[PDB]
Design a protein around this ligand. Structure first.
Ligand code: UVY
Length: 119
């Protein structure tokens, strides 16, 4: 029933993602000195510190908006990878599976609570 519970649930999921070794390439914006052509391929950079900062600033209205930004981290890694077997892309696939497994109930509970609110 709680329309606000998604926020702390997302904060706790972000804490687990930060503890995950697979999140290391995605914890801060991609370094353009390391990947000089990054912005030639990627239009909208995104990383987990920016997602956490947006959430803590009160700049997400719903967990769907947070989920769109986290999915953008993974789609950027898929678009920038030179190979489907690269180390960083392989880490992104595992982290994506972990994130999707945990965000599903957060989205479901929020949408259910909102439908109840508008009944
Ligand atoms: C640094 C962000 N990033 C790197 C890749 C592939 C490197 O093999 C995808 N995203």
């Amino acid at each position: 029933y709680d329309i606000q519970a998604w926020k702390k649930q997302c904060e706790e999921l972000l804490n687990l993602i930060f503890q995950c070794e697979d999140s290391e390439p995605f914890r801060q914006p991609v370094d353009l000195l390391e990947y000089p052509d990054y912005r030639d391929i990627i239009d909208t950079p995104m990383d987990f510190a920016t997602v956490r900062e947006t959430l803590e600033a009160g700049n997400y209205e719903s967990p769907m908006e947070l989920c769109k930004d986290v999915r953008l981290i993974f789609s950027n890694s898929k678009a920038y990878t030179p190979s489907k077997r690269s180390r960083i892309y392989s880490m992104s696939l595992r982290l994506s599976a972990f994130f999707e497994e945990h965000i599903s109930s957060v989205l479901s509970d929020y949408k259910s609570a909102l439908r109840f609110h508008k009944r």
